[PDB]
Amino acid sequence: MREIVHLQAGQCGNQIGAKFWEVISDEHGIDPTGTYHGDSDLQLERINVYYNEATGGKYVPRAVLVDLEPGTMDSVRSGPFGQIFRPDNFVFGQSGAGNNWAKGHYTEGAELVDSVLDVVRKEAESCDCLQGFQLTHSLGGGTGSGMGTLLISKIREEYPDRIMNTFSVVPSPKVSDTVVEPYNATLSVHQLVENTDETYCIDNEALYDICFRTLKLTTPTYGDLNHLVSATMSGVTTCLRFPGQLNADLRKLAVNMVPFPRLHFFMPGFAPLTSRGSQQYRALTVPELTQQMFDAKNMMAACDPRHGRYLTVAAVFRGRMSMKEVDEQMLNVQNKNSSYFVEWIPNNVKTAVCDIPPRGLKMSATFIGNSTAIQELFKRISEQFTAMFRRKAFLHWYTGEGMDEMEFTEAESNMNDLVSEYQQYQ
Amino acid sequence: PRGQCLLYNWEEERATNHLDQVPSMQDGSESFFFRHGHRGLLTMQLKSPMPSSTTQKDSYQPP
Amino acid sequence: MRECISIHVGQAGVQIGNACWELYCLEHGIQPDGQMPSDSFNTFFSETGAGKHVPRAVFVDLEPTVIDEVRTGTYRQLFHPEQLITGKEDAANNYARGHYTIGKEIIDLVLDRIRKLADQCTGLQGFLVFHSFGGGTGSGFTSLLMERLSVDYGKKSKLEFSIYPAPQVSTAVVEPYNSILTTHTTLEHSDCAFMVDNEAIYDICRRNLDIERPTYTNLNRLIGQIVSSITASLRFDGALNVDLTEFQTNLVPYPRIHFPLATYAPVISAEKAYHEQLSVAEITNACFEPANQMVKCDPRHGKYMACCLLYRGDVVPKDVNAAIATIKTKRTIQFVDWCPTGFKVGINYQPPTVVPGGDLAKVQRAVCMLSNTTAIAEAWARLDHKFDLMYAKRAFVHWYVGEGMEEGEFSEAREDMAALEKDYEEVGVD
Amino acid sequence: MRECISIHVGQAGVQIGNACWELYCLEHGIQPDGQMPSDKTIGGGDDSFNTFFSETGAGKHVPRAVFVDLEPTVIDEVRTGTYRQLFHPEQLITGKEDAANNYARGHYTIGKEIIDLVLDRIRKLADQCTGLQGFLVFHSFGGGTGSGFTSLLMERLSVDYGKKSKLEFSIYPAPQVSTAVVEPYNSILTTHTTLEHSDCAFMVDNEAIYDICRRNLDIERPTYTNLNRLIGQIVSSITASLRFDGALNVDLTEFQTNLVPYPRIHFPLATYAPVISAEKAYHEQLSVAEITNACFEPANQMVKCDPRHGKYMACCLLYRGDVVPKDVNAAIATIKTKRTIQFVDWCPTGFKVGINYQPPTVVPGGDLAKVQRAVCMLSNTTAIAEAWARLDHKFDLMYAKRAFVHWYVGEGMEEGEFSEAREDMAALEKDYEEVGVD
Ligand SMILES: Nc1nc2c(ncn2[C@@H]2O[C@H](COP(=O)(O)OP(=O)(O)OP(=O)(O)O)[C@@H](O)[C@H]2O)c(=O)[nH]1
Ligand SMILES: Nc1nc2c(ncn2[C@@H]2O[C@H](COP(=O)(O)OP(=O)(O)OP(=O)(O)O)[C@@H](O)[C@H]2O)c(=O)[nH]1
Ligand SMILES: Nc1nc2c(ncn2[C@@H]2O[C@H](COP(=O)(O)OP(=O)(O)O)[C@@H](O)[C@H]2O)c(=O)[nH]1
Ligand SMILES: [Mg+2]
Ligand SMILES: [Mg+2]
């Protein structure tokens, strides 16, 4: 009745999607074989959102997994939950990307899109009423930033009256994994701004900081990192799958969080991230839950809200709770933070409540909020773009593939126009 | 085992000895075994049922 | 499935591949007979209906003194009868013989074998080349191969591993002529070229492995370890994968600059390996030490431009990032102002495999660095100081002028690489 | 809801609270695991354990105590021993290097690197408490951590919390014997801070308690576990009025008013009765009359001083168990009849009494007998003026030729602090004879 089509691109998208389809399989009670093994009856009233029905009572994800290299598809199907992904839903090329935006968007990504548009048109026309789309990828790579942004342009012009959400992995100065990643970031962000509705910037210093001082883990493997971002992604769309007192889907979240079409950059956060030895010793209550949420420690972007001003803030709640304690705490945090919120718009906080918490917990929350402080992420990319483009470093990998310097010249100018637009509303 | 000597966050190691020492050298390393993630994270009591307690179903019972 | 073709030219190339392919055999468990005793080897080994894994390599040399031992020894059955091309007469330390007269007779056969191996692969990644500048075959026939390969195959990746003549000691006298004359082709017909130095490997083996008196096999073990650590990503699963088209783009900023340096860590013996605590920071700061470099040049004088790091074993990205932050903190390592984010990192699960009778210890984690540095202009200048001295009195030039080439090619090969040095200093200007 | 916060500073403070919190668990029936026994679990609306334990929704009872020290060799066995699953993993704070009998290290150099974390812990425990009554602080005078850090702590709690009650339990460098050499310096330098920032401070001597354990309990070689049973018994007797019902209830802000006549005199003495063995309690009679005069005996006082030489100012009596108010009032007038016990003419009525219903509890492997009633004495006496003088006789002889002073002045303090800490006690001492003038 309201289906969500899931798009995974790149190596980073493949590992996040493997974790994401593991968590909501645990939430909906789906074994690695594909048969429902659960006890309650409310898990099947809304199961068609992510799972298509097949013979023998088997449920399969409505997701497509793409990458230019076949080296990561073998690891996807060799995972714990690699036996439920459809073999048709794997689209792979035979040549790499080389962390190049030009290779993945113009030369090698030109012929791999027509296969995946055929697959996604087959999937999208098979549902009764599609709620929207969803993509996770990485801007620091060649495939997710290159071919994924091609899928942004093609889908947005083929299905116009649909909602587009992206969980983008923004790059880092200190976790700089690629030499040429400022090129692959600016050329991805420029195509991303005009052709989406909701963006969620996930960055890796925040996940490394959370796994160090908040969870007290000594070996924060990517499986530990991906479980945090997958919990947020499952926490966004809880109202579509489970009932509650005040339901709010992705469209209702996007209306109240996006005042202007070029202001669509959020900055996520989660709730109870307590260490294993400290779980027994704390009282898990609503004021203790919302104390952690507004702090900058558990927040999943490498930006400080104290250096900026909030515009809109949303919180999605789970589990049985008193509505008065939600309204009193949101009013209290709005009154005490009279300087951290803008004054030209009242009631910047939105709330939503579901009744089903995740497994092993009793109530959780998800923080979705945009801020002016997200410009600190874009100022450091633009200044390192300008410092390197002036001496034409690594240019022959781009201008030798059919690209032109004018596309480089406009990309910085549109990105400078975006960071100039964020400043006026502070 | 792990965390015998009393330095470098020995409490969390001693509390989670029973959850991170399942392997018996058949596999290379802890990172190689937990490449998919640690078994107990963000919760405990790993086998716990879904509640069927809807607010409407609790409030409106047969009188 | 993604595979590459390895080509070994000259006596240095065949004796490097001779020790590299046995490490490739031991990494995948291939016995020297050529069969599995009981698909990650598809990058190097070709399947057969009888279960034989035939390597996809090319060996070429103009003399049979070295390849007949390959035709004789334990790896006789494993290697193909026609993947080992031998000539009739050696080039004998001359560029003109290897590039104009002797090298033209076997190049068609070599290209036929290359096409016969290239028709097998559904997807090809690139060509790795192993040769030495000082030898006549590795100077001339390599240049002919690099000229004739780019015409036949357009945009295939071309990686090189060069045995450079050392600035102090060498095994010939006329090798500056060959070193100048091969750059005039390999500057424009090559995507990337890594550099090694025999006396640097000598110093590393004498100071770290405690073997004060090494051998060519002892050097080739470390060289093959470098190549295995480079190509482990196409074979073994890991958290992050790199390709032959990845670090080429991440390390070549300009088409005229494709010369990085290679470094390995940890290099330690089995006797003292059990005492030192081998940590991620303690193995990644040894790569930045100038005394651990594999080329006799000091990076303190020069400036880094890009760096690529490859990790093998029980490595976690958190310690890697905490060590990159520490190595960015210090002033002793200097970076140019136009590359603020210069690091590439890749992670592989499999720890390195040791060889029976080998020198290296069995370690849990290893790291390899390929770093582009401006300090190779010093290495070019120290050989210019020899080339001018040799060419002033016009010594050893009569064989060159009588074997077919024109004397003006000497002046052209000096002038273009002088312009290349000017380009290096222009890039090095802040 | 009437709750108090207990903090244990120094090696002596955390060792007392190790043996004091096990007495709290057995009085309220809490297992060392941290939960009530399942055989007798029931819901009855009890708030007696709330004074010391915070309820968690899983049935776990977390104590509201903070353990702070600078060396890990005293905290880690609390973290390893039987009560490892009872204490909060972050309520107990360890340092890196000890103060090592240095007031300058515990107040200026090392103690300032932990004080921000400690007040953060105090703030978080205070945010949970709906209604707070006061702070109970446990330390010893002689040690560097117990002299410097609790002085730094006490001057930081007063600027944060304005008018909260501060109750202090201090262990004193014994007059004849000592486990340290420089501890006369640390005892002088800790009390110029606790004179002005402490509402009340109680007094415990190690060498005196040895004699009660040797004669009454008949333990010829006592150990630290034996001494801490008596120390934890007094605090349990003091705080019994908040937890348990009784005829007369005394609040933490009540006996502070009744025992502090002047702002410079806030040093009472503690006495417990009846302390007795299990064998000779069978022979003896232990009614109200013979337990209320045993606390008046100079040999049963836990501070080595003579009340015969001194003068009583105010007394507070706390009774537990099968005690009726009739014979207590009859026993008080018997005490006032005796001429050996002398009172100030400025205080005609110096007694305050309190009755509680629940008798004291014992511990397995304990030394005290299972008795029916007990009385705890909190008396303010002028006789402490001899106890300052006998340590001032040690201070001036040590300071005659500047022994051990170069490491105090090497950490960052000024040599004039010793002179200031001597003159104010000389002024403090003369305040005691001036109020002692009839
Ligand atoms: N590191 C290393 N270097 C080698 C090895 N074998 C040869 N070399 C180098 O090769 C140089 C000698 O030139 P060769 O490779 O033998 O000559 P060639 O390429 O066969 O050319 P011709 O002999 O004229 O046919 C020496 O200076 C060595 O530095 C080896 O096993 N390891
Ligand atoms: N009554 C009693 N006193 C104790 C006990 N443990 C230690 N003490 C006292 O503590 C003194 C020893 O110095 P401490 O106060 O413990 O030294 P500290 O607090 O650790 O200070 P630093 O050593 O600098 O860290 C002795 O004189 C004892 O009187 C105990 O269990 N019972
Ligand atoms: N948080 C997280 N980040 C990842 C994961 N896998 C890869 N990445 C990030 O993805 C970036 C590399 O992207 P890349 O693989 O080159 O993208 P692709 O070429 O499109 O496949 C690095 O900066 C990594 O930090 C993961 O499992 N979790
Ligand atoms: Mg030869
Ligand atoms: Mg101590």
Side-chain angles (χ1 to χ4, degrees):
Chain A
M1 61 79 71
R2 272 185 284 193
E3 280 80 8
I4 290 176
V5 166
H6 193 242
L7 261 68
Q8 293 307 104
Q11 177 199 115
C12 178
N14 272 268
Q15 293 190 310
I16 291 178
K19 179 64 70 174
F20 179 47
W21 287 112
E22 185 262 354
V23 169
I24 58 191
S25 295
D26 187 280
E27 181 154 55
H28 269 276
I30 290 295
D31 65 347
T33 310
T35 302
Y36 167 69
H37 295 105
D39 44 353
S40 172
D41 207 35
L42 54 89
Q43 310 177 8
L44 280 77
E45 53 197 3
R46 281 98 175 87
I47 209 166
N48 48 336
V49 181
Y50 294 93
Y51 296 88
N52 261 325
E53 190 276 332
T55 182
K58 265 177 72 174
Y59 289 107
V60 295
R62 200 188 321 264
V64 289
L65 264 66
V66 292
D67 198 345
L68 264 66
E69 50 182 0
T72 186
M73 321 285 198
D74 283 287
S75 186
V76 159
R77 57 168 56 103
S78 302
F81 278 70
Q83 279 308 294
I84 60 172
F85 301 131
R86 179 188 284 271
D88 164 27
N89 277 5
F90 295 111
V91 174
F92 55 94
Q94 268 81 359
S95 182
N99 290 138
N100 205 318
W101 192 74
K103 294 261 298 206
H105 204 91
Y106 273 72
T107 298
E108 287 271 3
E111 80 263 3
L112 277 296
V113 288
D114 285 272
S115 65
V116 72
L117 276 296
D118 172 43
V119 172
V120 73
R121 277 199 299 265
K122 161 83 192 145
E123 291 294 324
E125 292 294 324
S126 74
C127 69
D128 206 348
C129 173
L130 196 58
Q131 206 266 355
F133 288 97
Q134 188 189 31
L135 165 65
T136 75
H137 70 282
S138 187
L139 314 172
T143 293
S145 163
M147 182 179 72
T149 45
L150 257 183
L151 267 298
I152 300 299
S153 161
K154 294 255 172 278
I155 290 163
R156 271 292 306 198
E157 75 182 3
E158 206 272 334
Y159 283 135
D161 202 330
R162 300 291 171 86
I163 172 168
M164 201 65 188
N165 291 25
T166 182
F167 286 86
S168 179
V169 184
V170 292
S172 174
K174 274 83 65 181
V175 177
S176 296
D177 182 352
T178 300
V179 188
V180 66
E181 55 88 11
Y183 284 168
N184 300 331
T186 61
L187 296 162
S188 59
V189 167
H190 160 251
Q191 266 67 23
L192 186 148
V193 167
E194 292 89 5
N195 290 318
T196 188
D197 294 331
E198 288 197 303
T199 76
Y200 310 97
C201 300
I202 294 175
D203 190 359
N204 272 287
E205 300 82 318
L207 306 192
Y208 281 145
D209 288 331
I210 287 160
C211 282
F212 189 39
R213 65 188 35 81
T214 314
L215 272 73
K216 290 191 168 190
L217 304 183
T218 69
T219 58
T221 312
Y222 283 159
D224 310 321
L225 296 194
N226 287 5
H227 188 253
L228 260 61
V229 300
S230 165
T232 296
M233 293 177 70
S234 173
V236 165
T237 77
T238 72
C239 295
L240 287 181
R241 313 177 290 173
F242 296 128
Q245 316 170 305
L246 191 44
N247 318 314
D249 48 344
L250 306 104
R251 184 177 279 105
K252 203 191 282 279
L253 283 177
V255 162
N256 295 115
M257 295 298 103
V258 181
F260 292 136
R262 281 181 138 261
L263 294 173
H264 50 272
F265 280 79
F266 308 131
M267 155 181 168
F270 205 57
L273 277 299
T274 65
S275 173
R276 275 95 69 82
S278 178
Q279 285 190 3
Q280 310 262 37
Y281 292 87
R282 79 169 281 164
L284 188 153
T285 187
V286 183
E288 285 288 327
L289 190 136
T290 189
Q291 182 260 7
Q292 198 209 357
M293 182 179 72
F294 272 106
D295 204 353
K297 309 304 150 292
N298 52 358
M299 186 179 289
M300 293 180 183
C303 288
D304 202 0
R306 294 169 268 149
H307 299 335
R309 277 202 145 171
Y310 280 123
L311 289 181
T312 62
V313 164
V316 180
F317 275 101
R318 284 162 149 280
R320 321 187 49 116
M321 51 175 38
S322 179
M323 211 65 178
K324 200 187 63 64
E325 289 277 347
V326 173
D327 294 7
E328 183 209 286
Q329 282 295 325
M330 295 298 102
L331 180 65
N332 202 4
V333 69
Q334 195 167 2
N335 261 352
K336 299 297 185 291
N337 292 349
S338 193
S339 64
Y340 300 108
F341 288 101
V342 290
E343 308 274 347
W344 57 268
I345 184 168
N347 309 339
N348 305 330
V349 189
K350 184 178 184 293
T351 49
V353 169
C354 292
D355 66 342
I356 294 303
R359 184 193 289 285
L361 295 175
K362 55 183 69 58
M363 51 175 148
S364 170
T366 306
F367 181 87
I368 301 299
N370 74 316
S371 189
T372 305
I374 207 63
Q375 208 197 307
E376 190 169 351
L377 192 163
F378 287 142
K379 277 172 91 92
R380 88 168 81 103
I381 299 180
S382 181
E383 70 180 3
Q384 77 183 2
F385 181 86
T386 314
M388 182 179 72
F389 179 70
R390 285 199 272 96
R391 304 178 59 75
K392 292 140 183 199
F394 302 90
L395 196 56
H396 86 274
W397 303 122
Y398 290 88
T399 190
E401 210 59 36
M403 208 152 292
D404 310 278
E405 291 66 351
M406 271 315 307
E407 189 176 4
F408 278 33
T409 312
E410 61 86 20
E412 41 184 18
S413 284
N414 199 4
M415 184 177 177
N416 290 318
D417 278 332
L418 178 79
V419 306
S420 192
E421 180 260 331
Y422 263 100
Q423 276 301 140
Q424 291 225 350
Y425 292 164
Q426 190 185 7
Chain B
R2 196 191 41 180
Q4 307 277 60
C5 190
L6 298 183
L7 78 164
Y8 289 138
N9 192 20
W10 62 273
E11 291 304 14
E12 282 326 290
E13 286 158 354
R14 280 198 186 192
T16 68
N17 277 324
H18 64 92
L19 192 138
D20 299 349
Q21 290 168 100
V22 180
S24 54
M25 291 56 68
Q26 327 298 316
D27 62 358
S29 54
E30 163 153 358
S31 303
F32 179 77
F33 192 41
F34 296 115
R35 54 170 185 277
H36 297 332
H38 290 126
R39 175 173 331 131
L41 206 56
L42 273 45
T43 183
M44 291 315 218
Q45 58 269 10
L46 277 296
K47 194 53 42 173
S48 284
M50 281 315 138
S52 303
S53 65
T54 308
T55 48
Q56 196 266 352
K57 291 188 65 59
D58 194 328
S59 304
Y60 304 93
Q61 293 172 292
Chain C
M1 183 278 288
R2 292 149 315 154
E3 66 177 2
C4 64
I5 295 294
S6 310
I7 301 165
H8 313 268
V9 189
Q11 188 274 331
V14 299
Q15 269 184 347
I16 282 164
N18 194 1
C20 172
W21 278 103
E22 67 96 16
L23 194 56
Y24 284 166
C25 286
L26 288 179
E27 273 202 290
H28 302 296
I30 300 298
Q31 68 186 11
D33 166 57
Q35 320 177 20
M36 201 85 58
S38 296
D39 56 344
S40 57
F41 38 75
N42 274 118
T43 77
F44 294 127
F45 293 105
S46 43
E47 272 71 63
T48 314
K52 179 139 161 52
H53 288 302
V54 175
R56 276 174 190 119
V58 174
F59 280 46
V60 285
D61 190 19
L62 288 178
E63 74 258 18
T65 305
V66 56
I67 297 170
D68 291 331
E69 265 172 7
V70 168
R71 281 148 144 83
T72 298
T74 318
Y75 298 91
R76 183 181 31 52
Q77 280 279 320
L78 173 66
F79 281 155
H80 205 272
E82 297 151 332
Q83 277 185 15
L84 311 170
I85 295 155
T86 179
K88 198 58 58 195
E89 207 171 9
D90 50 348
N93 282 141
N94 205 340
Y95 185 78
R97 296 201 39 144
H99 194 263
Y100 287 98
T101 63
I102 310 299
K104 92 203 302 183
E105 315 276 7
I106 78 159
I107 185 68
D108 301 322
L109 187 68
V110 173
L111 281 183
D112 165 57
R113 293 326 293 187
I114 282 293
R115 186 71 255 190
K116 201 53 183 313
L117 266 71
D119 273 358
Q120 184 58 73
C121 54
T122 63
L124 185 56
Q125 295 286 126
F127 298 98
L128 317 182
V129 186
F130 293 82
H131 74 274
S132 70
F133 289 159
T137 295
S139 198
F141 183 73
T142 314
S143 163
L144 294 174
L145 180 54
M146 295 299 290
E147 266 178 270
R148 288 272 292 250
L149 190 150
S150 176
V151 175
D152 217 320
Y153 298 119
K155 324 172 81 193
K156 300 299 288 184
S157 194
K158 282 186 271 285
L159 268 59
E160 277 183 48
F161 311 98
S162 292
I163 306 287
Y164 202 57
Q168 258 182 336
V169 71
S170 66
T171 74
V173 56
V174 73
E175 77 276 12
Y177 280 171
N178 282 287
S179 309
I180 301 299
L181 285 172
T182 186
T183 51
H184 187 273
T185 309
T186 62
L187 201 63
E188 67 269 58
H189 289 356
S190 166
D191 291 331
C192 195
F194 304 137
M195 295 299 291
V196 285
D197 273 328
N198 262 4
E199 92 279 26
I201 312 300
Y202 283 154
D203 301 334
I204 289 301
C205 185
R206 172 274 319 280
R207 287 169 24 196
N208 298 138
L209 294 174
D210 279 339
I211 302 171
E212 75 156 8
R213 186 154 38 223
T215 316
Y216 277 166
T217 75
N218 202 294
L219 313 190
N220 291 351
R221 286 329 293 129
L222 279 73
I223 295 172
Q225 196 66 257
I226 294 296
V227 189
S228 300
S229 70
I230 283 178
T231 64
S233 179
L234 305 178
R235 299 175 298 173
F236 302 142
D237 198 3
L240 293 97
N241 287 316
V242 305
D243 299 327
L244 302 189
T245 179
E246 279 277 39
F247 51 87
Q248 157 192 343
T249 57
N250 266 308
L251 291 173
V252 178
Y254 294 97
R256 300 301 294 285
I257 318 163
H258 42 90
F259 294 141
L261 309 170
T263 310
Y264 196 87
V267 180
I268 204 165
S269 74
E271 160 168 60
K272 59 168 69 172
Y274 288 151
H275 299 275
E276 178 98 1
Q277 169 78 285
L278 277 192
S279 166
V280 181
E282 283 213 9
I283 67 169
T284 195
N285 62 353
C287 292
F288 274 99
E289 287 286 326
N292 304 337
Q293 213 156 58
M294 288 203 160
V295 164
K296 211 52 178 295
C297 288
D298 210 335
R300 193 147 48 205
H301 310 331
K303 305 186 216 163
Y304 292 89
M305 293 182 286
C307 298
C308 188
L309 275 175
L310 291 63
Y311 277 100
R312 297 269 301 278
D314 49 339
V315 62
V316 57
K318 160 78 83 170
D319 291 331
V320 175
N321 288 2
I324 300 299
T326 313
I327 212 67
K328 279 196 172 185
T329 299
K330 50 170 45 59
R331 186 267 182 275
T332 309
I333 293 306
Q334 191 197 331
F335 262 99
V336 287
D337 64 326
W338 50 269
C339 193
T341 72
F343 272 106
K344 177 79 179 68
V345 286
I347 301 284
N348 199 316
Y349 288 161
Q350 181 139 345
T353 310
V354 309
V355 286
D359 62 358
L360 274 179
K362 181 173 172 64
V363 299
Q364 289 277 14
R365 43 189 77 102
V367 60
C368 175
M369 185 180 288
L370 309 169
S371 51
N372 199 358
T373 316
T374 317
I376 311 171
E378 174 179 359
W380 301 125
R382 298 341 288 170
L383 192 149
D384 271 321
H385 182 74
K386 305 187 163 108
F387 183 82
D388 278 327
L389 282 179
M390 185 180 288
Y391 191 74
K393 262 65 66 179
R394 221 159 277 280
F396 303 104
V397 71
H398 50 99
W399 290 298
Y400 292 85
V401 76
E403 273 273 359
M405 65 179 288
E406 175 85 41
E407 201 146 346
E409 183 178 1
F410 292 102
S411 68
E412 290 293 324
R414 178 53 184 257
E415 164 186 327
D416 67 338
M417 172 294 267
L420 167 82
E421 282 188 346
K422 191 170 316 284
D423 186 74
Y424 291 167
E425 81 194 69
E426 282 282 320
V427 167
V429 175
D430 278 325
Chain D
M1 61 79 71
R2 298 92 59 82
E3 295 179 353
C4 302
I5 292 174
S6 303
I7 52 179
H8 302 279
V9 192
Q11 195 263 330
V14 298
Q15 276 217 304
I16 280 173
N18 213 340
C20 175
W21 274 102
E22 68 178 2
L23 198 75
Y24 292 165
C25 285
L26 294 174
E27 278 205 299
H28 296 300
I30 306 298
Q31 289 197 14
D33 186 74
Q35 298 183 6
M36 291 205 48
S38 63
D39 70 325
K40 292 188 285 186
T41 45
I42 198 170
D46 289 329
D47 74 347
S48 176
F49 48 87
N50 280 145
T51 62
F52 292 131
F53 296 101
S54 44
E55 165 82 345
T56 314
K60 194 143 157 54
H61 293 111
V62 176
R64 39 175 47 82
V66 175
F67 279 50
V68 57
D69 203 88
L70 300 179
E71 42 184 9
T73 42
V74 65
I75 298 175
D76 285 332
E77 293 82 3
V78 191
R79 275 148 177 201
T80 304
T82 307
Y83 295 99
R84 58 188 295 275
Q85 324 200 61
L86 166 75
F87 280 127
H88 200 284
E90 297 155 330
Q91 270 172 5
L92 77 173
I93 302 302
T94 186
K96 298 293 183 182
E97 294 280 19
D98 51 349
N101 281 323
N102 206 334
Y103 180 82
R105 288 185 62 86
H107 189 266
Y108 290 99
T109 66
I110 312 299
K112 72 177 183 293
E113 271 172 0
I114 302 299
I115 190 77
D116 62 358
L117 181 61
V118 174
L119 277 296
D120 178 17
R121 292 288 104 188
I122 294 298
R123 157 146 305 283
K124 284 190 185 294
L125 274 71
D127 275 354
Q128 191 98 340
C129 183
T130 69
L132 191 56
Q133 269 167 337
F135 298 88
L136 317 177
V137 188
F138 286 79
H139 76 251
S140 176
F141 279 166
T145 306
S147 179
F149 191 75
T150 185
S151 69
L152 178 72
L153 199 52
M154 185 180 288
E155 61 90 19
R156 286 277 293 247
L157 269 292
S158 177
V159 71
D160 188 21
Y161 305 86
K163 304 83 161 163
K164 301 299 288 184
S165 196
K166 273 87 171 177
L167 274 299
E168 168 61 53
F169 289 87
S170 291
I171 298 171
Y172 194 82
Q176 262 183 343
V177 307
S178 278
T179 72
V181 187
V182 73
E183 61 170 22
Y185 281 179
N186 310 114
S187 51
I188 290 294
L189 292 185
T190 181
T191 187
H192 62 87
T193 309
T194 71
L195 261 172
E196 62 183 1
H197 295 107
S198 165
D199 274 28
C200 199
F202 297 97
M203 262 315 317
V204 165
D205 186 74
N206 262 4
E207 201 270 332
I209 290 182
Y210 283 171
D211 271 24
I212 296 89
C213 291
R214 207 266 291 279
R215 288 158 22 205
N216 294 141
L217 292 185
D218 190 359
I219 317 175
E220 193 268 329
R221 295 181 295 175
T223 62
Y224 291 168
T225 77
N226 302 125
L227 316 181
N228 298 333
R229 298 296 215 282
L230 277 78
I231 300 302
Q233 205 62 253
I234 300 162
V235 191
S236 68
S237 81
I238 282 175
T239 62
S241 307
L242 317 169
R243 299 176 289 167
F244 309 138
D245 62 357
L248 280 78
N249 294 317
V250 191
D251 200 0
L252 277 296
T253 187
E254 269 183 309
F255 62 91
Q256 170 186 350
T257 307
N258 292 115
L259 266 69
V260 181
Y262 294 99
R264 285 290 279 281
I265 315 163
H266 42 82
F267 297 138
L269 308 174
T271 308
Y272 194 81
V275 64
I276 206 170
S277 81
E279 190 276 331
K280 74 176 75 175
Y282 193 15
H283 282 97
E284 212 183 317
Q285 173 168 0
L286 300 191
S287 169
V288 185
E290 53 264 27
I291 64 171
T292 196
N293 59 357
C295 64
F296 271 102
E297 287 292 323
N300 304 331
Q301 320 282 353
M302 309 214 189
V303 181
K304 189 63 69 69
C305 76
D306 205 346
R308 191 143 45 208
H309 303 333
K311 186 66 66 67
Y312 286 88
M313 299 214 55
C315 297
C316 183
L317 290 181
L318 312 169
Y319 283 95
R320 297 179 53 124
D322 200 337
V323 168
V324 287
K326 294 182 191 73
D327 46 15
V328 178
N329 189 359
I332 284 300
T334 315
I335 291 299
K336 280 189 180 182
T337 313
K338 285 263 271 202
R339 82 157 170 268
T340 309
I341 320 179
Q342 311 272 46
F343 285 159
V344 183
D345 291 21
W346 265 260
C347 282
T349 61
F351 294 119
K352 188 183 170 62
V353 293
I355 314 290
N356 197 316
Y357 284 159
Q358 184 168 358
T361 70
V362 303
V363 285
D367 291 331
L368 316 180
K370 183 173 175 67
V371 301
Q372 62 181 359
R373 46 182 75 110
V375 55
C376 183
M377 201 195 207
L378 269 56
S379 52
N380 197 1
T381 316
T382 300
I384 304 169
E386 292 90 308
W388 319 106
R390 56 177 74 242
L391 188 153
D392 288 320
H393 201 307
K394 284 189 257 200
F395 181 71
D396 54 355
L397 267 296
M398 185 64 72
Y399 203 58
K401 59 178 69 65
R402 313 276 166 171
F404 299 93
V405 77
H406 52 109
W407 291 353
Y408 279 80
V409 309
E411 299 285 302
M413 73 167 38
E414 179 82 44
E415 205 149 358
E417 187 205 57
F418 287 81
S419 64
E420 295 191 32
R422 180 57 194 268
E423 57 95 11
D424 62 355
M425 306 266 298
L428 167 80
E429 205 191 339
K430 292 303 312 283
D431 290 333
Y432 292 166
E433 293 84 4
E434 280 180 357
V435 69
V437 172
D438 201 25

